[PDB]
Amino acid sequence: LVDSETRVLVQGITGREGSFHAKAMLEYGTKVVAGVTPGKGGSEVHGVPVYDSVKEALAEHPEINTSIVFVPAPFAPDAVYEAVDAGIRLVVVITEGIPVHDTMRFVNYARQKGATIIGPNCPGAITPGQAKVGIMPGHIFKEGGVAVVSRSGTLTYEISYMLTRQGIGQSTVIGIGGDPIVGLSFTEALKLFQEDPQTEALVLIGEIGGDMEERAAEMIKKGEFTKPVIAYIAGRTGTYEGKVKALREAGVEVAETPFEVPELVRKAL
């Protein structure tokens, strides 16, 4: 979902986080072509042109295909609707603290319109060496063949870094969010990675709550994902126990500790 063709629009760019990450993404090599902040149109942040609306940004920059949201919770839902209605197909929502019902509403709307939501309450996505649409520091990642999908932001960093230190690079790393309801799920992520030629193995980082991990083991058991899967579930249906048992009966190598993931991956490779 994230590569050299990524053209990013940053919603909430004049803000503290929006401006900082717009700069960090640029320095990493991500093509950030514009930003939006109502009332700041005509301005500029770190060289990036600012527009009062997504519509105006797109008029002047039609190559935009991805948006990242750094807008406070009260305004995050609106930012998502504005992007989707403008035709943007991938919207990364970093924003934390959005009422669950509101997220349920804009995620369903996005699904209805053919848009993909990553988040909310997530660090975004990164394809080491190609592009970053998120908040993760690029130095802890490395270009490789292991996909990482995670509900936990901290574990995404810790586990990715561990893999990198062992010389085990990643294809695309996606933090799908830690809220009760998020957009892209483990099963959907697995579907994407199954068709990704750069991905040889996948690391699934879950935790208690929801049935997303259980549905992923379910789709794997059905043979919908045939590459090796190493998982880790924090919190040691919805229970830690139930998730582990479920993934294991699906043929997934579950790690007892995060420190065990690298070796589980090295062998599977």
Side-chain angles (χ1 to χ4, degrees):
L1 294 172
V2 165
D3 59 45
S4 69
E5 291 198 64
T6 291
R7 295 296 181 279
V8 179
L9 166 66
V10 175
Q11 290 173 269
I13 188 159
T14 61
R16 293 171 181 173
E17 315 193 321
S19 61
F20 181 91
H21 293 289
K23 189 181 175 189
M25 282 183 276
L26 281 172
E27 301 183 349
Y28 189 72
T30 299
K31 305 290 194 308
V32 181
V33 310
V36 173
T37 296
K40 295 291 175 184
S43 59
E44 174 173 292
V45 175
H46 301 297
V48 184
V50 185
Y51 299 89
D52 292 314
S53 74
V54 173
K55 180 184 180 65
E56 298 164 85
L58 282 177
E60 193 150 304
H61 300 279
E63 75 277 29
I64 287 169
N65 52 42
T66 307
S67 183
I68 181 159
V69 188
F70 286 101
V71 161
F75 297 103
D78 267 25
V80 176
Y81 288 111
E82 190 185 5
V84 176
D85 281 346
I88 297 176
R89 315 288 260 291
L90 177 56
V91 186
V92 180
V93 184
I94 307 298
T95 309
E96 137 170 55
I98 304 173
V100 179
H101 279 101
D102 291 317
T103 292
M104 173 272 288
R105 278 184 288 269
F106 70 70
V107 163
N108 283 350
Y109 183 71
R111 196 181 304 294
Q112 154 187 172
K113 299 299 177 179
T116 294
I117 298 296
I118 289 184
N121 181 34
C122 76
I126 182 177
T127 291
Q130 300 299 308
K132 168 175 72 167
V133 181
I135 64 179
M136 66 283 280
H139 80 278
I140 69 176
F141 300 101
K142 172 184 173 53
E143 196 151 25
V146 179
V148 183
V149 189
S150 173
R151 287 175 62 194
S152 175
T154 57
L155 287 173
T156 298
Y157 286 22
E158 294 166 29
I159 292 183
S160 290
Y161 175 68
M162 286 184 269
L163 287 170
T164 300
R165 298 297 286 179
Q166 293 305 300
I168 300 171
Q170 313 83 53
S171 47
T172 295
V173 176
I174 311 176
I176 59 177
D179 276 355
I181 297 180
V182 294
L184 187 75
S185 67
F186 282 134
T187 68
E188 288 174 312
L190 283 166
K191 277 178 165 57
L192 283 163
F193 285 114
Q194 170 63 36
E195 305 308 311
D196 173 29
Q198 192 181 323
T199 295
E200 300 273 36
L202 180 156
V203 172
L204 190 163
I205 302 175
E207 59 186 60
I208 74 174
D211 65 322
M212 206 166 70
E213 287 78 353
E214 293 87 328
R215 314 193 79 125
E218 204 172 68
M219 79 85 80
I220 293 168
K221 288 175 184 171
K222 293 178 179 174
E224 285 177 53
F225 189 81
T226 70
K227 305 172 177 181
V229 175
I230 295 72
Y232 176 67
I233 305 301
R236 177 194 172 77
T237 175
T239 69
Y240 168 83
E241 322 300 334
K243 291 178 186 303
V244 170
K245 193 182 187 69
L247 286 166
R248 279 180 175 166
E249 49 182 45
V252 174
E253 286 286 297
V254 178
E256 297 294 302
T257 184
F259 308 105
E260 279 184 60
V261 174
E263 259 305 305
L264 289 182
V265 174
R266 195 186 295 294
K267 284 171 183 166
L269 295 181

